Every structure is written in C-alpha cells, then in structure tokens.
Amino acid sequence: AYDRAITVFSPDGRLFQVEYAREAVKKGSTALGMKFANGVLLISDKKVRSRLIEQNSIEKIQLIDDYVAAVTSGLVADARVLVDFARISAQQEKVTYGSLVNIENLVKRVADQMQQYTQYGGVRPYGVSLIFAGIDQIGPRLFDCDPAGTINEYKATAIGSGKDAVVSFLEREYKENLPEKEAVTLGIKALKSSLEEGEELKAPEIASITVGNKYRIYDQEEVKKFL
Amino acid sequence: AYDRAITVFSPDGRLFQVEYAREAVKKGSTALGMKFANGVLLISDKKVRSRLIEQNSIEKIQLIDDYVAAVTSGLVADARVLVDFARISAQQEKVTYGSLVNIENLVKRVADQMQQYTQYGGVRPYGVSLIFAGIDQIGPRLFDCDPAGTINEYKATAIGSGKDAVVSFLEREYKENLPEKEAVTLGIKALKSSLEEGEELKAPEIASITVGNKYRIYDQEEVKKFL
Amino acid sequence: AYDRAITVFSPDGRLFQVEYAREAVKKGSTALGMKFANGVLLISDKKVRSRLIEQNSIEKIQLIDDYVAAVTSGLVADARVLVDFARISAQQEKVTYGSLVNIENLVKRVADQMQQYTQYGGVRPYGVSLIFAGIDQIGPRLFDCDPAGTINEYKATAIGSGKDAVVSFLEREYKENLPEKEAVTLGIKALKSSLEEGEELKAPEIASITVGNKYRIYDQEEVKKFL
Amino acid sequence: AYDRAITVFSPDGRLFQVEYAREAVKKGSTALGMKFANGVLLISDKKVRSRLIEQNSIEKIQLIDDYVAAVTSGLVADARVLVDFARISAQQEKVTYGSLVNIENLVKRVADQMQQYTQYGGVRPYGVSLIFAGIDQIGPRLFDCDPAGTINEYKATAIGSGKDAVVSFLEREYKENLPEKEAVTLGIKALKSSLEEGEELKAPEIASITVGNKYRIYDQEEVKKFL
Amino acid sequence: AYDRAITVFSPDGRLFQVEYAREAVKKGSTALGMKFANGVLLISDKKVRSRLIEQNSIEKIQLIDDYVAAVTSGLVADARVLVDFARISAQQEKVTYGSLVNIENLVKRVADQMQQYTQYGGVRPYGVSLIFAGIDQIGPRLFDCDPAGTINEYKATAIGSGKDAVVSFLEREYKENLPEKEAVTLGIKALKSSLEEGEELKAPEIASITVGNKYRIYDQEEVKKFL
Amino acid sequence: AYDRAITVFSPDGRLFQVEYAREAVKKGSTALGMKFANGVLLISDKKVRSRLIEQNSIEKIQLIDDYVAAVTSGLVADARVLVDFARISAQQEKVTYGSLVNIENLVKRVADQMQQYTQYGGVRPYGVSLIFAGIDQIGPRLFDCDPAGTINEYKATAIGSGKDAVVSFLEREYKENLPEKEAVTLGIKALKSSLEEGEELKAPEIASITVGNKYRIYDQEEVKKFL
Amino acid sequence: KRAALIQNLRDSYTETSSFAVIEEWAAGTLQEIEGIAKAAVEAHGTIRNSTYGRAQAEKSPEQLLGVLQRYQDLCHNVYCQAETIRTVIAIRIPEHKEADNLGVAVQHAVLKVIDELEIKTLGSGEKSGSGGAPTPIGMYALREYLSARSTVEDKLLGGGSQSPSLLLELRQIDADFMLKVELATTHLSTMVRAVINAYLLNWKKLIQPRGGHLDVLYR
Amino acid sequence: KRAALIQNLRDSYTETSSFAVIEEWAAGTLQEIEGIAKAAVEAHGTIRNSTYGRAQAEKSPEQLLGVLQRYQDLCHNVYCQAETIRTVIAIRIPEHKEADNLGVAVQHAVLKVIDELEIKTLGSGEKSGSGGAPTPIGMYALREYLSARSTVEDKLLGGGSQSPSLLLELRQIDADFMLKVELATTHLSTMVRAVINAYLLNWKKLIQPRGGHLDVLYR
Amino acid sequence: KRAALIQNLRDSYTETSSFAVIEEWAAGTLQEIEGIAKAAVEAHGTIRNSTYGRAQAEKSPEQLLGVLQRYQDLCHNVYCQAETIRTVIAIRIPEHKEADNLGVAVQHAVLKVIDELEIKTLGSGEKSGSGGAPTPIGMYALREYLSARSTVEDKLLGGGSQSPSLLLELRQIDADFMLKVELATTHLSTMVRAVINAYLLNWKKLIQPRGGHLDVLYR
C-alpha cells in the first residue's frame, strides 16, 4: 500500500517507486563497456529488428561529444530525453569552461536532474540507466547513472537485463590495460555469457576512444570479425 | 490498481496509462507510407462517410509545409492540436534557421511536446500517433511519433488498427528504390491485406513528393486507377 | 471507476468524462443549418416557454458578427460563455487582420479553447456544441464545434437531441444549391421528422445570409408561413 | 458517488454540485418583481424577526445604484459578497463609460463571476440567486441571475422557496403596463398565494422606479395599505 | 460523507464545515452588549482562572481604537489573529480617510476576510465570532461577525455558549435609551439567566462609550457593585 | 476520521491535528519560570545524557538577546527552528525600533508564525511550546507560546510533561516579589513535585535577569547548592 | 404501448390507497392489537391460578383457541395491508441509474423497514438456525400450539405416563403460549408505529423518487 | 463461425418474445392469481365454519386439492415464463471489461430481481436454516399438504389416538394451508408487478448493454 | 524441462477442443434438453389424468424411470463437457502478478459462470441449509425418486395404512417429480445459452490473458 507515491517511505525505509523504475531499467537490452590502456570502449547488444528501420536510429550508443559518449537501457522515450539533456549540458559546460574539462560533472548534471524527480510528488522518475565513457583532462572515464541518480566511476560495468551476469563475468575475468582488441574480445565473451541457452549473439554495436583521438564506431564488418 | 495515474510504475515497471493512450491510437484507421527512389509517399485509408461532410476536412494527411507533411490516427481532437503544433514548430524552425533544414527536429519538437505529458500529474497524454514524411537537405525522410514521444526513422511503416498487418506485409515484401507508381501499388496491396474479410477497400487518400519538387495529392481518379 | 477524472484513459482508451460532456450536449433542443446557392441558413427549435420571458433573450441563434453567426445546445451557462468568447475572438481577429477574413480560425480559437479543458485536471469541459455559419472571403461556411473541440466543415448538420434523426434525414434528402426558400422548407421537414409522436412543431427561429449581404432573422410571421 | 466535485459530470451529464447550490437558493425567502408602464418594481417577503435587529440591515432589496437595484435569496454570506461585487462592477462600468449605460452587462459581470466558480476545482459556487431591476438607456429592465450564472431577462419573476408558485400565478394572471399601484397589488396577491395554510403575510419590503426618476422604497405604512 | 471539505454542498444545500466552525464558536464563554441613550456597552463573562495569569491578557474585550472595541468567542488562536486584523484594518481605514469615519466597513474588512476562507479548499475558516461596538459619525454602533462572515447591526446581542438564552432574555426585556447604569444592570441579569443551576456569576469585564467620549473599562470594583 | 487534516473541524468543532501537536509538546521534559522582585528566572529539567555530548548544545534555555531569553519543549528540530526565528525577529524588531522595546511583539512574531501553520493544508504545525522571559521598557515579562500560537503573559508557568503538576504546585504556593534565591528554591520544589516516585532530580539549568542587568546562567555548582 | 401499461399500474395502486391503509393502521389496528393483548393478559393469569390433572389433557382450552385465532387473523390482515404499501412503493421505483439515487435510497430504506415488519408478522417455528432475533410466533400460532400440546396429550393419555413434570409441562405450554402472544402484540405495536412514522415522513420522496425541472438548466 | 452462433442464439431468443411474456403477465397471470386467491379465501372460511370428527380423517378435501393444484400450475407457468426473460437477458451480457459497465449493472440488477421472484416461486419446505424471509410454499404445496396431513391421519386412525388437540390440529392444517396459499398469492402479485415495472423501464439498456459510436471520437 | 510440461498441457487441451464442445452445446444438447422437456410435459399430464389405488403402489412407473434416466445422462454429459472448458481455461491462467490482471479477471468471471452451471447440474437433495436458490434436482433424480416413493410404498403395503392422503401423496410424488424435471430442463437451457454467449464473446482474452509487445516500449 506504499508503492504508489514517489514520496513515501516503507517502515523498512525503502522507496518502492524508485525501485520499480530500477526494475523498468532491467527490461532493456544489455550494454557494457570498460577502460583499457589509454582509452575506453562500449559494447551494446541489439536483437536485430525490422529491415524497414533505418539502422542509424536504433543505436543504443550515442555521441554526446567528439570526446564523450554513452549508452542507455530502459524506457525509450525517457532514454532519448536523457541523451538530449546530456548533450545540452555538455554544451553548457563547454561554453562556460572553454572545453569539456571533466566528464564527471557532465554526469553530475545528468545525475542531479534524474535525482530530483525521485523526490517530488506529481513527477515520476526516469526509467533509464546511462553509462558514460570518454577522455578528459584526466584520461579514460567510465560512469553509470541509475534512475535514482547514483553515479559511480568504474573500470568496467554493464546495464540492462544481463547486467548481473556480465558484471559477474568481468568480476572474475577482467584485467586492466589490455590492448584494445583483446579488451573488446573479453567484453564480447562477457556479453555472450549473459544470454539464455539457444540464443545466438547477433551483431552488437561497439565503439571506442583512445587518448588524443576522437571516437569511432566499429562498422558491422569490423564487428563481424569478433563473432 | 496502478493504471489510474500517469506517474506511477507497476512492480514490473510499466506505465499502463501511456499504454492505454497507445491503445487509443489503435482505434483509428490505418495509414501508411514509405520512401522510394528520390522521395516518399503516404497512404491513408478512409471508410467513406456522410456526403454532407466537405471532403476537404476529413483528410488524415495534412501539409505541414510545402516540403513536410504527415498523417495521424487516434483521438480527433488531440490529432488536430498536434498537427497544429507541427505547423507552428515548422514555422519557428524555418524562421530561426532561414528554412526547414532538417525534418528531424521538427519531429523532435513534436516528440518532446508529446513526451512531456507522459510524466506530469494533472495532464493526460495525447492519444494520437503521427507519421511525418518529406524532403530536407538530406533527402527523403519518414518518421513515426507515438504517444510516449518515441520517434524512429523508417523506410516504411503504418499506424492505426491495421499497423501490425501492414508492417508484417512490408516486412516481407518491401524493396527500396521503386519508381513511384510501383511503390504506390505495393502500398495499396499492403493496405488491402490489413482489412477483414468481406470488406472492400474504398478510395484512400495518397500523396507524395520527389527530390526538388513540392507535394501533390493524387486526386480521387488518379487514386481510382490503382483499385 | 475511470469516469471520474478528465485526465484518465480507460483500458480501451476512452475519455468517459469528455463523452459525458457530449451526453450533456444531447439534452439540448435541436438546431440545424445548411448552405445553399450563395449563402447559408440556420434553424433552431424552441419549445415555447413562459410569456413573462422577453423573447429577445431565448434565441439559440446569436450574431457573432454582421457576417458570422452561430447556435448552441447544452448547458446554458457554458453556452453563453462560449458565444461571448466567439464574439471576443471575432473582434481580436478583425483587429489584427482588418476584417474577419476567414470564419475558420474564429472557429479555431473557440475550438482550441474548448479543447484545452479536456486535458487538464481541476477543470471540467464545456457541455455545449456550437454550429457556426457565415460568409467570408471564400463564401458560405458551416462548422460544428463539439465539447472535445473537434471541428468539421459541412454542407448540412444539426446538433442537440434530434441530431441523429436530422442528419439521417439530410443524409438522404439534401441536395445543394437550393434557392433559399426551398432550402428552408427542406430543413423544416428535417426538423419535423426529429420530434416524437404527438408533438407539434412550434415556431422555430430561422435566419440566413447571402453572398454580399448581412444577416437577417426571419421574424415569427415570415417563419409562420412554413408551418 | 458523483455529487462530490464541482468538475465531474454524471453519465446522464448533470452537475449535481451546481444543482445543490440551486437547492441552497430554494431555502431562502421569496422575492419577486416585474416591470410595468414606465418602470419596474420589486417585492420581497420578510418573516419579521428580533426587534433587537436594526431593520436597516435585513433588507433583501439593495440599491446598487440610484438607477439599478436588486434582491437575493440563499446563503447570506455569499449574498452580501455578491451585492458588493454588483456595486463595484457598477462603479467600474460607470467610470469606463461615463454612466451605467445598460444594466445588462452589469448583470454580465456578476454572471461571469458566478459562472466561473462552477467550473474550477477547489472552489464552491455561490448559493444565491439575484434579481436585478432598473432603468437604463433602453428602459425598464428585469433579470434573474442564478448560481450557475444563467441570466434571462423577464417581464416578471420570483426567486426563493415560493418561486414556482409565484411564477405559476404570474404565468396566468400578469398583464403588462399596469399603473404602478395595480401592479403592486397583483404582485402582493402573487406573494400571498405562495405561503402555506395558516401563515399570514407580514409586511414585505417593496420598492420601484419609473422612467426619469430614481428609486424609492415604500416605507412600512405605504406598504401597510396593501395588506 | 460531505462534512469533510469546505467547498462541497449537501443535497439539501448546506455547508457543514462552516456550521462546524459555528459550533466551535459555541464552546466559548458568553459575551454580550447593547446600545443605549448616547452610547453602547459590552459585557463578557469570565470564569476566573489561575492567579498566575496576568489579568491583562485574558480580557475578551479588546480596544481596536479609542472609538471602536470588540469581543470574541471561540478558538483563542483565531480570536487573537482576528482582533489583530481588526486593528490593522482600522489603521488602514483611518489613514486613507483621515479618521475611522464609519465602523461598518471596518466590520466589512473583517467580514470579507472571514468569508473568503469559507470558499476555498486548503483553508479552514475561523472558529470565532466577533461583536463590534463603538461611536462613529453616525453614533452608537453594534455588529456581530460570525464565522461565515455574516454581519448584522443590532441594538443588543450576545455570542458564546449562552447566546440563545441571553438573546431570549433581551428579546423580551430590552428597552432602548436606558441611562448607562440601568442598561448595565439589565445586561447583568441577561448574563445571569444564561448560566446553569448552582453556578454563581463571577466578576465579568464590562466597558462602555458615550457620544463624544472615549472608552473606559469598569475596573473590578466598579463591576463589583452590580453583583 | 477527522484527525487527518489540519483544516477540518469535528462536529463538536475541534482541531484534533492541532491538539496532537499539543500532545507532542507533552512528551518533552519539564521547564518552568517566574518573575519576582525586579526580574524573572527560568528553570529547565534535564535528565543527564551521554558524556560524549558537549553540554553547550543540550541547553533547553537559550538567549535570544542579552535582554530576552526562552526555553522549549517538544520536537527538537522544530524547537531549534523556532528559537532561530525568535532570534531573527528580535533582530528585525531591534533594527526597526532601535532596541527591543517590548518583548510582547517578539512573542507576537513567533506566535503569528506558529499560528499560520495551523490553518493551511500541506503544512503541519510546530510541535513545540516556548516560554519567553526578559526585561523591557515595562519590566519583567513572562509568556508562553503554544503550538496553536496562543500567547498569554503570566507570573509563573511551566511547559512539558510535568506542566500540570508544576502549575498545580505554583497555583497554591507561589507568592510574588520573592528575593531571587527564595524564588529559585520555590521553583526547584515545584520541579521536584512533578517527577515520579523513585526519580531523583538531577541538576537542572537555571538562569535569571534583574532590572538593569543582563542575563546570567547559574553554572552547575551554583545550581548544586539548591539540590 | 408501454407508457399506457405503466400508467395503468400506477393508477391502479396509488398514494391514496396507501394512505388509507396508513389511516387504518393509525386507528383501528392499534386498538385491536391492544384488545388481543389484554385478552392474552387475562388468559395468562387464568391459566396461572390453576392446578391440572388428567382431565385437562382431554379437552382443548377453547378460550386460548379463540385468543390465538384473533391474533392469527390480525397478523393476516396486517401482512396484506403491508403488501399493499410494498406494491405502491415498488411500482414507482424509477429507471436504474448510477447517479440521482437520493430518493431511490429513501424507497429502499422504507421497503427495508416494511421487510422487518413482515418478517416478524409472517410466522415461523423455532427454527434454531438464525443467530439474529428469534421471531415471535406469527401466523402459525394455533398450529404450533396444537402440535406441542398434542404431543404431551399423547404422552399423557397413551396406559399413560407417570411424570408430574409432563403434566406441569402441559400447564406451562398453556401459560407460555399466551405469554408469547402478549410479547408478540407488544412488538407488533412497536413496529407498526415505526412504519407509520416512516411513511408519513417520507411519502413525498416515495411517490416522487426524483423531481425534474431540467429545462431551467438545459436549453 | 462464432458470430453466426451468437446471432443464432439472439435471433432465437429476442426482445419481442420477452415482451410477449411481459404482456401475458400484465393481463392474464394477474387475474388468474386473483381468482386462485378468492378461491383460497372462500375455502378458508368453508373450513373455518366446521367441526371435525373421525370421518374427516378418512377422506381428503378434494376442493383444497384443486385449489393447491391450481396454485401449483400457476407457479410452474410463472417460473418458466421468468426463465424465458432470464435467458433473453443472459444471452446479451457483453464482453467482460473493467470499464463501461453502466448498462451491464442494469442487467445484473434486473437479473437479481428475477432471482427474487423465482426463489419465492420455486418451492421449499420449512427449511429452518435461513435467517432471511421464509419462503411461502411454492411448487410443493400439494406435497407438503399431503405429508403433514397423512402424519395426523396415521396418528388418528392407527387403534387410534385420543388427543382432541390432534383432531383440531388436522383442522388447523386444512385452514392454515389455504391461508398460506392466499398469503403466497398476494406476495406473488407484488413481485410480478415489480418485475413488470423493472423490465418496462430498463428494456433499452437490457437489449443494448452499451451503445457504440466511437467513429465520431476515434478516426 | 518446465516449459515442455506447460506446452504439453496446453497442446493436450486446446481452444479447438473447447470450441468443439461449444458447437456441440449449440446444436445437439439444446434439442436433447427440449425433447426430454416435452417427454416430461407429456408424462406430467399422463399422471394427472389418473386416480390411484393399491395397485399403483406395487409397480414402479417405468416411463417415469426412463424420463429420469434420460435427464440424468444429459446432466452427466453436460457436466463432463463443462469440466473440459474449465480445464482449458484453467491451464492458461498466467503468472500471478499484482498488476496486468485485466484478462485474468475475464477468466475468473467465465470460470464463475461455469461454476454456476455445474452447481446447478450436479445433484443435490433438499439440503434445507442454503438461503440461496434451491438447486433443481440434478444427478440424483432417480435416486431421490425411488427413495421418496419407496417410503410411501412401505407405508402403504406394510397390514397397510388407511390414509387417503398417503395415496394422493404417492400420486403427487409421481406428478411432482416430472414437474421438477421440466423446471430443471428449462433452467439448464437458460444457463447453457448464457455460457455459450460468454465463451463466444470472451475466448480471445480467455486464451490470451495478456498480450505482450514490450519490445516497442522497452529497448
């Protein structure tokens, strides 16, 4: 009888509405990423859909800058609104400081925005989690921003329905400073071991950055190598 | 007990109110469209009504510009309010950039407008889906904007009560770059195979655009050819 | 359990509150009108009441301009507020464009006003439908504006409790471009065939306009001819 | 289960809250008035109360101007607030137009004010009905403004608990252009035939105006004649 | 099920919340007053309390001016807020007109203030009634302002738990223009006959004004005479 | 079913929410004070707690000025917010009048602030009572401000859980104008007779002021004398 | 035509018929209940001041038979007159809507009261199944009397039995059923006067379940 | 095909069949109830003005048998005609949704009323288990008559018994069951006229549980 | 594997099996009910136009035995065919969630209706415990017939009894149980046609308790 309002605690002291938004994240497809020797990558599973769909607009990975990029999972409407707010806050940060100096408070803008809606009545939170990654003045970065707003900087994570299995794999297999290719293949195996039996891993979008370089997205045939 | 407010998630994590607006879209008549070799068309079914009605104001297809146009399905009141907002945002985009440069962020204005009402209490969303189509600096475009605000650029789609059957047909029959006429007849067959048994396809409004040209609407006797 | 708020859809996807406002329109007396060879008329039934009432203020037909006029049905309070807003919007339209150029967006002002209250909590909609008619730069016009705001331009319609029977008659009898008198008598027969058995049609108010002329209201003895 | 909010329609399409305000009017004492040959009068029943009460402040009839006056029935608090708003709007109309040119839109200001509270949540309507009467540029006037805001100009009416019986009498007895005295005595008989058996009509306040003159209130002994 | 909100009528048409505020007035101790030959007095019962209480701040009678004064009954918090608003409005009236010209619209300011809270949700009304009395340009004045805002000018009244018995006494005993002393003793007998059996009338605060003079409060031994 | 909102009266006419705030005051520890020959003191019981707590910040007595001081009981959060508002209003009073001229309307600022929250929905009241005391232009002062805002100036009182027993003692023992020491010991006996059997009175904070002097707080060994 | 049939029912059972039944209950029924109650009072003490033997088991007490018969006829007349008012109310239950049921609830309440009157006027033996109020006898008083008496008469006549408690039980049957009669008459007086109160206060809403003047608001 | 089967049911049991049943109840059923009631009235006093002996326990009262048989046949015909209306309403209960149930609730209410009519038309002995209204006899009147009479006839014939209260109990069985007949006919008149009222006011919502013109709002 | 077992159940009892049962009820069951009803009609009047003696208590009416046997076999077949539809619905009740139960409530409603059909098809004696609708006989018609007849046959044969009301009670047993048969067949017709309506309107939600296309919203 308490999971009806965003502003009411349980007698345990839980926010079931916030947790249901976290559950709504869990219904989205798995997407992971990690940093390595001078840079970070991202991997995102896509169960291939209608060939009538222009492939340009089903990319879970999105470029928020030439030097910051991210990926979502959850409600598709809230997902797009969020990646928009990430872009706009990147622009405001870049204009008030001359450049995107640190990725961390771009993630802070997004985090405080997503946090605020977990506190006021008449508003529902965002049912999306976001994984930011890029290069700043410090170097390779990797965050995850959840519905409640909580951000944590990692060396590797996932989000989505697989997230537990992928972080379980990486938790016992990941070793830092891999040269880019080896890192990617480790992450591919991580993504593989999250599917259910019988499911064949289709072609996932993967993109990376190295220190001093911009992004690039591996096209489908560079992806096709690591199948 | 949760499908009463726009701002409350289920313990699965669903927004049943948003889904009911999507259901209210489903009660509208089928309308489809696709791009082809230099341009895009639209097709909209109309079960012919009262001859006292001026045919000028039952057109589900509407011109938002000489170079952008769209079609709706769902609540007729919200439908008209939406096509109005599309026109006004087209005017604002055209005045701040000198021309409608890209159709995509006209669709973004409409999308963010429709998205916002899926988040705040005291407001119901729009029970209408919209299919935009036109020519920009890039070329042939084709979107669909749903009640939750989600936009996706396609090469072919429908909306309305048939939508599943039409996209099922196009999913196994559509081949790109058809010369305009052949494309139209394929779309007519698509629209045909969505009706129920015994129903005869009446005369549907169809209109198109090619690269470097404005719209035109096929009048009823140019339509009458493809019966 | 869903017909309590203006902002909640049913799992079919219906707005029962908007529908109940449409039902409240249905309790009002029948009023019809149609265009003809150079102009439009209006007919409104009145079951004759207390002779203490000054007949000047029971007229369901009202002049919004020398060139636009309309008629209501439903809640009398909301009815009067609406015909007021129609007059004021006609004045604002006439001052920003020098003349009431087209009747259509006078009807749009009224339509958007009536639509807005079908969307926000804390407000009930208007339980009135309005039939506009007049002469513009284009010519004879005839709209109907319902509680949800939906407007449609016809060649003939009614509103009120009879509306179905009258539009049923006109749907199989109306032929355009009648000379004014013949048109009026057709509409009188239309109004007649909507009553119940035993009821005698009393004297209804009827008024018209022709291209290049102002309105006039047929006085009761010019009305008395067509009994 | 629907008569709890001002903003919810029944599935018939009624506004029970507005109707309950109309019922709250019915608990007030009867007051009537009519126009005659060059002018209008008002009659108001008063069941005589405590002699400690200064008779100056129990007058249901109130002067809103030297040329407009009215009478209420219902909630005494809302009654006084309404006659205040009538006075203030008379002042504003008089200052923007140099004089109270027409009584009708004084009644409109009061009507729109009372109408607005029958539409918005968080507000209850006024449980008072008002009968305005006076002399303008046109001549003798007589309105009644109900809780919903509906105004109608009559030649004779009442309000209050008797209203049906009085208008029933006037509906079969009233003949216009009576010289003032005869009119008053007709209205006295009207007021008499609304009481219950055994009740003796006490002394009612009655006041009038003629074309070119101000008001006057018949004092109690000029009233005492027509007993 | 209707006595829960300030803004909902019963199907009779009553405002039970307003009436419950009137009931909350009834729990306060009796206080009365009347005018006489050139002036007005006030009498207020006080069941004598803790001798630790400074007698200066238990006076139900309060001076709003050197020429206006009043007395309350009901909730002591709302009581003090009201006598504050009376003082402040007296100051504003005195500064915009040079002097407190008429007591009546000081009472109007207080009345409209108390009335407004009987109309809007989210606010409860004041559970206090006030009896104003003083000398103006006209002469001796005596009002009572109830929770609903209703004001009435009397020649004698009470408020509080006794109010019915006191006004019942005065209704059959009061004769105007008594010389001050005789008036006071009549009011003392009035206050006496409102108590219950066995209760002995303690010392009540009584104060008066005459035309051309300021107030004074009879001190306890001038009070002690009329025991 | 009525003790749920701050804005709803019972059919008796009570405000149970306000009374529950008064009950929340009752759960706090006893604190008392009285005036004497040229000045006032305060006494506050403290059941001695953790020696980790800096004794500086458990003082229920607080200095709002060098010449005004007070003590609370109830909710500790609301208590601190209130003594803050007392300090700030003392500063505003002192700057607009050059000095804290009278303590009474400092208490009025606090009183109106605490009263306002007992009237509007969406706000809960303060569950704290405050006892002000000091020296002004008039002399020794002593108020108590309760949750509803009601202020009363006394010669002696308490607040808290003992309040009834202490005021019962003082009601039969207190005699004014005691020289400071004797007054203190009387108040100590008053505080003693409010405890339960077996409880030993620990060391209570006590502080005073005399006419022409500032405050001082008796330190614990000057307190230790009167044990 | 449908309206003709509805009008035919309502003109058949009208308010003046109902109010004539109410006038009959207001005068005659009450003094008849009181007279039967006084007869029960007298017969109770008549049985009480006696001592029985075998001879009383050989003849039925015709005085008690007459008292029971009078009470039975009264309950029949009261039940029929109650069913009249039931029909008068029930043929004016309006069209079933989900709103507007203010006057409808008045009709349901009055029908509920008449249900109580007729459930305690209609007869019932000791059912030993209901946890509510056990119904004082009702219609089948003379039936239950003769059954419970005839069992003891069989046991006493046969050779016959020897239990003196059986003979005293026969005596207690006689006095006890007259006691039950006077209890039931007191309760019937109570319930009838309650029904008269309810009808005479609510008859306007009973005949008009809702008033309609929608032409004032809707035009 | 499914729609063909639904249409086959509704064309089989239609509104004109239901309304013909309503017309039959409106005329003939009511005067037949009244005639059986008058026969019960006359037979009651016929039993009342008599004194029984052993000879009345040797032959069944064929007049009372005929009255009970007429009432039994009436209750059978009324129950079958009620089941007709039940089926007419029940084959038009729409698709079960969680909204839109305004007209559906009307159907449930009318079915609930017909349930009361048929639970007090169908027969039941004195069950002594229900705390509600005990049902006046119903279908099994002649059964219950012959059972309760045959017990006393066995006790009187055998040697036979000697209880005079047993003989008077036989007399009371005779008069009492005719009394029960006239009570039941009065209540059946009440309930039938209530059902006629309910149908003739609600038949439009009974046949159309909801109206659909969604093409006006949804396009 | 679990999904294999669920699929094994659903492939065993599918919608076409349920709809074949519905087609069988739509044609054959109804005319069989009607034929048994007409046989009950004819046998009722056959008993009615007769006068019994000792000889009718010596032989059972084999015609009535055949009518009861036909009704019993019909009720058995109807109950088994109803249990088929019960199982078809019950093996598709989805995962129990606190939301999404729109289609689930449709399944509960249809199961509730089938419960009424089978509680009035399954047999029951006069239980005298239920305050609701007394169930017309059901399965145990021939059982209850032979029991209630054999009691009276014992009392008539023995020397035998002398009550003429006992002999007429035997006659009333015969006519009355055929009357109960025709009542029960009418009610079964009503309930079966109601169930056919409910299934043919709700079968889509019965087979799919909820539709899932969450990939449109969740990605």
Swiss-Prot record, chains A, B, C, D, E, F:
SMART domains in alphabetical order: Proteasome_A_N (SM00948)
BP GO annotations: proteasomal protein catabolic process; ubiquitin-dependent protein catabolic process
One Pfam family in the UniProt entry: Proteasome_A_N
Recorded GO CC terms: cytoplasm; proteasome core complex, alpha-subunit complex
Localization per record: Cytoplasm
Keywords: Cytoplasm, Proteasome
Effect of residue 76 to A: No effect on PAN's ability to stimulate gate opening
Signal peptide segment: none
Superkingdom of the source species: Archaea
Known regulation of activity: The formation of the proteasomal ATPase PAN-20S proteasome complex, via the docking of the C-termini of PAN into the intersubunit pockets in the alpha-rings, triggers opening of the gate for substrate entry. Interconversion between the open-gate and close-gate conformations leads to a dynamic regulation of the 20S proteasome proteolysis activity.
Effect of residue 76 to D/G: Prevents PAN to stimulate gate opening
InterPro entries: Ntn_hydrolases_N (IPR029055), Proteasome_alpha (IPR050115), Proteasome_alpha-type (IPR023332), Proteasome_asu_arc (IPR019982), Proteasome_asu_N (IPR000426), Proteasome_sua/b (IPR001353)
Matches recorded under SUPFAM superfamilies: N-terminal nucleophile aminohydrolases (Ntn hydrolases)
Record-level Gene Ontology MF annotations: endopeptidase activity; threonine-type endopeptidase activity
Family: Belongs to the peptidase T1A family.
Additional comment: The configuration of the closed gate contains an opening large enough to allow rapid entry of tetrapeptides but able to impede the entry of proteins and longer peptides.
Function: Component of the proteasome core, a large protease complex with broad specificity involved in protein degradation. The T.acidophilum proteasome is able to cleave oligopeptides after Tyr, Leu, Phe, and to a lesser extent after Glu and Arg. Thus, displays chymotrypsin-like activity and low level of caspase-like and trypsin-like activities.
Subunit structure: The 20S proteasome core is composed of 14 alpha and 14 beta subunits that assemble into four stacked heptameric rings, resulting in a barrel-shaped structure. The two inner rings, each composed of seven catalytic beta subunits, are sandwiched by two outer rings, each composed of seven alpha subunits. The catalytic chamber with the active sites is on the inside of the barrel. Has a gated structure, the ends of the cylinder being occluded by the N-termini of the alpha-subunits. Is capped at one or both ends by the proteasome regulatory ATPase, PAN.
Protein name: Proteasome subunit alpha
